[PDB]
Design a protein around this ligand. Structure first.
Ligand SMILES: CSc1nccnn1
Ligand SMILES: [Mn+2]
Ligand SMILES: [Mn+2]
Lengths: 137, 137
């Protein structure tokens, strides 16, 4: 059967600024780059940045809610979010509707998130403060 | 410091067919559902389906190369691809890289992939046959 996420591939319009964002600003590990892409890891996540002439820099009001959240500890969350803020990283959401999260945009407008907590913890929180109509299996 | 992918959230135009696709066709575990979304797991992956009226059913020619690859064993790959084909799931790309890959679309046109092989495997293959301009770190 399917066993998890093998890799996340993001189309990027300019490779070097995107590599710098994920490696320098977000602290991900850069393993290789070539004329048309790069391979990074974030813990167990395999991230591929793929230079795509079709990728547009997309304002957050023009894209849907599809987004990618990265795990961070409770101890590191606030200072990492504040550092992104001080660095001028654009945002896309302010209301914490799914726990402790910071919502920010990559250079092409990919919707990203820092989040503290697992699925199990989110389900436990939702049992006390459920979303409308919520059923647990 | 970021420790991995926390969750992947896909905006969906209709919740019921998306739940059917990820739970029933793809075999993911459904943990909770509410009026405007669902939480599923696939191995370590926490997947959120978020009902979003802004989600367009998007032809693959009209979206960039951003995509989400799920892990499957070599032994299971061909029968899973055949299951998707029997269900009439559209393919958006043929495989031309190392490791088995099947490139398929979800009901809203999200670009998905079944892939066999890790980042370490890909890096080893690239070391032997580097892409144009490839540098390792
Ligand atoms: C070589 S381009 C690519 N590489 C890995 C994953 N997705 N795309
Ligand atoms: Mn999220
Ligand atoms: Mn891929």
């Amino acid at each position: 059967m399917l066993s998890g996420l093998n890799h996340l591939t993001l189309a990027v319009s300019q490779l070097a600024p995107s590599v710098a964002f994920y490696q320098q600003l977000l602290g991900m590990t850069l393993h290789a780059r070539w004329d048309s892409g790069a391979y990074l890891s974030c813990g167990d996540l395999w991230l591929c940045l793929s230079l795509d002439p079709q990728r547009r820099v997309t304002p957050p009001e023009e894209s849907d809610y599809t987004h990618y959240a990265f795990s961070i500890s409770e101890a590191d969350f606030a200072s990492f979010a504040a550092r992104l803020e001080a660095a001028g990283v654009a945002v896309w959401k302010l209301n914490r509707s799914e726990g402790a999260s910071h919502y920010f945009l990559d250079p092409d407008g990919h919707k990203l998130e820092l989040h503290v907590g697992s699925l199990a913890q989110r389900l436990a929180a939702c049992r006390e403060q459920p979303y409308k109509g919520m059923v647990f299996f």
